[PDB]
Amino acid sequence: MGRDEAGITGTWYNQLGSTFIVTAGADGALTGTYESAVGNAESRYVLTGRYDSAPATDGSGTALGWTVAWKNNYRNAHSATTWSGQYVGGAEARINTQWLLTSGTTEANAWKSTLVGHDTFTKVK
Amino acid sequence: MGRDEAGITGTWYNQLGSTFIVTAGADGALTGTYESAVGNAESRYVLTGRYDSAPATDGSGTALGWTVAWKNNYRNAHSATTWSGQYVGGAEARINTQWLLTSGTTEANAWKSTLVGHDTFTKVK
Amino acid sequence: MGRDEAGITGTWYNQLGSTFIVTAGADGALTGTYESAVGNAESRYVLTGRYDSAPATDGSGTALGWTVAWKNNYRNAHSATTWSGQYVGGAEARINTQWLLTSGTTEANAWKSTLVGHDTFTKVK
Amino acid sequence: MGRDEAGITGTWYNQLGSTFIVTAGADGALTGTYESAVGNAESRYVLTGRYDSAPATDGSGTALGWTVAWKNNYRNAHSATTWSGQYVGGAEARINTQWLLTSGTTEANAWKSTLVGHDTFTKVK
Ligand SMILES: [Cu+2]
Ligand SMILES: [Cu+2]
Ligand SMILES: [Cu+2]
Ligand SMILES: [Cu+2]
Numbered sequence: 001m002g003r004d005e006a007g008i009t010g011t012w013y014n015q016l017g018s019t020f021i022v023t024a025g026a027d028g029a030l031t032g033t034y035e036s037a038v039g040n041a042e043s044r045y046v047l048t049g050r051y052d053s054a055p056a057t058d059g060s061g062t063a064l065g066w067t068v069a070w071k072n073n074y075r076n077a078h079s080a081t082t083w084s085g086q087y088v089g090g091a092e093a094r095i096n097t098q099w100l101l102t103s104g105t106t107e108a109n110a111w112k113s114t115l116v117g118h119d120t121f122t123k124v125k
Numbered sequence: 126m127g128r129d130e131a132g133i134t135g136t137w138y139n140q141l142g143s144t145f146i147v148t149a150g151a152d153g154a155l156t157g158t159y160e161s162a163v164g165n166a167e168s169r170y171v172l173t174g175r176y177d178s179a180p181a182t183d184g185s186g187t188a189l190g191w192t193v194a195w196k197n198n199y200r201n202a203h204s205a206t207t208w209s210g211q212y213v214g215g216a217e218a219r220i221n222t223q224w225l226l227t228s229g230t231t232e233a234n235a236w237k238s239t240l241v242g243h244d245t246f247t248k249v250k
Numbered sequence: 251m252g253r254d255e256a257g258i259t260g261t262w263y264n265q266l267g268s269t270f271i272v273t274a275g276a277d278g279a280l281t282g283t284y285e286s287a288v289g290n291a292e293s294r295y296v297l298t299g300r301y302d303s304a305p306a307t308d309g310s311g312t313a314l315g316w317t318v319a320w321k322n323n324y325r326n327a328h329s330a331t332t333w334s335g336q337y338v339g340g341a342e343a344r345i346n347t348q349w350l351l352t353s354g355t356t357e358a359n360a361w362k363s364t365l366v367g368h369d370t371f372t373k374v375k
Numbered sequence: 376m377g378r379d380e381a382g383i384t385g386t387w388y389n390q391l392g393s394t395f396i397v398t399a400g401a402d403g404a405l406t407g408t409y410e411s412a413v414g415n416a417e418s419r420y421v422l423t424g425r426y427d428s429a430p431a432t433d434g435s436g437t438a439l440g441w442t443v444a445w446k447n448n449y450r451n452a453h454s455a456t457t458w459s460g461q462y463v464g465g466a467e468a469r470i471n472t473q474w475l476l477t478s479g480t481t482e483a484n485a486w487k488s489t490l491v492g493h494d495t496f497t498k499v500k
Contacts, residue, residue: 016361028171028194038361046153048173049207050194052229056203060229061238065192065207069153069175078181082174082190082207084225086238098225098239098491100209100366104177104185111266111288113186113211114223116350116366116473118493141486163486223366225491236391236413241348241475241491243368278421278444296403298423299457300444302479306453310479311488315457317440319403319425328431332424332440332457334475336488348475348489350459354427354435363436363461364473 001026002053004062007089012121020047020095020121022066028053034068040077041070051087061086064095079103083119095121126151127178129187132214137246145172145220145246147191153178159193165202166195176212186211189220204228208244220246251276252303254312257339262371270297270345270371272316278303284318290327291320301337311336314345329353333369345371376401377428379437382464387496395422395470395496397441403428409443415452416445426462436461439470454478458494470496 008024017037021044022030030049035041049066065084070077085097101115133149142162146169147155155174160166174191190209195202210222226240258274267287271294272280280299285291299316315334320327335347351365383399392412396419397405405424410416424441440459445452460472476490 028196029173030192038358046175048154048175049192050171050173050205052194052196052201052203052205054196054201055229059231060203061231061235063194063203063205063227063229065194065205065225065227067155067174067190067192067207067209069177069188069190071153071177071179076177076179078177078185078188080175080177080188080190080209082192082209082225084192084205084207084227084239086227086229086235088232096235098227098493100190100207100223100225102188102190102209102211102223104180104188104211106184106186107213108288110186110211110221111367112365114209114366115362116364116491117361118473163483223368233413236492237490239491240487241366241489242486243348278446279423280442296425298404298425299442300421300423300455302444302446302451302453302455304446304451305479309481310453311481311485313444313453313455313477313479315442315444315455315475315477317405317424317442317457317459319427319438319440321403321427321429326427326429328427328435328438330425330427330438330440330459332442332459332475334442334455334457334477334489336477336479336485338482346485348477350440350457350473350475352438352440352459352461352473354430354438354461356434356436357463360436360461360471364459 002028003055004087004089005053007093008051008087010123012095012123013125014119014121016119024051026053030064030066040075042074043072045070045072061088093123097121127153128180129176129212129214130178132218133176133212135248137220137248138250139244139246141244149176151178155189155191165200167199168197170195170197186213218248222246252278253305254337254339255303257343258301258337260373262345262373263375264369264371266369274301276303280314280316290325292324293322295320295322311338343373347371377403378430379426379462379464380428382468383426383462385498387470387498388500389494389496391494399426401428405439405441415450417449418447420445420447436463468498472496
């Protein structure tokens, strides 16, 4: 029922070699797993997020976001990343994101708690 | 079972007058609703996210994040915000965040798609 | 000649206890020194930046930004911070900023090169 | 005298078609002009910034940053962008950046004052 439900659902890969597996729900839900090719991470982590299930029909992308807390049965990196971005459909479909990775810190170290970057996800590679 | 499950669960208010209502699950899940006092928003929006359910015990905060897609039964702002931050417990408990708000745009306008800011949430006011 | 040339010029202090000393030029130039209370820093560092020397007169703030490269005669932290923000005049004058702190890294570590945060500067404390 | 003084100095182009012309000083100064291919901008704007004039020699990039206030003789967009990033030398030399673009706003609208993005600059195209 969601406009890009079919387009978003599936496996995505970013420029670092990380793998994102997501199911988009009719209502706007995103659920899946994330596996990072870098950092203090191993195997799959739970992700959850939201997307605009009724986007503009004027060539605009579809806004979405999701979160991974970097705790699973193997490791705990005491941190969470949120990706905020848009899905762009078509022959070379893309999810273009910026992200914020916050670590748990003392109050004294909170100024250096948050990394920022950008990931581009594609259906191939 | 989550260390700050009790501490995170409940109603939070930020510096803009927005209201965040969240339930923290034992496993790391965050579920709830968000009501923004500003922007192209009215009433409650679904949120989902994740938190570190077993944080460090050295005075460090608890990493977490969540997403709101700004579509509900009243409005659709074709955008999504992700908050990335940490929960700090105690007498004046806080969730200190930075956020990324991405709008759906054409490819030509993608350079101006994403706002960034910071929200501090407290249990009062 | 710049509208907030007088208002911006002088000594500013942020929430971390850092000290910013700046001279605003008529043309839009910012020149001065920065001393950080935190991180891999000691004593004063050169800063340079720019501000809007003819801002809107509708209660709006004055856009500005500046850069510090964290090399001086004492230390080199192989990094640079840029602050982007606005000056708000009046009895409790403020410079409200967000910043990006990029470290020199290998290409493999570039994903974790950039910290993000927010500093508020006041004329007192 | 600066390690990458020669490498940084010159004309750079980003993915939007914008042109950055910079001179790197021996001491760490960056001076030049910026011409944006997008947004509320026309012709050249003054930029100033800083770079690490003695970077690490372990394959690491060179940290740098600069600011443009979007006022010149043609237009005033009541805003300033800061780019924070690193210069990576070699056959395909790059300046990889993230940026913050703050507009002058009322206090009520300050939450939506700041855009964030990322630009990659190359010596060709
Ligand atoms: Cu619409
Ligand atoms: Cu631990
Ligand atoms: Cu004007
Ligand atoms: Cu060194």
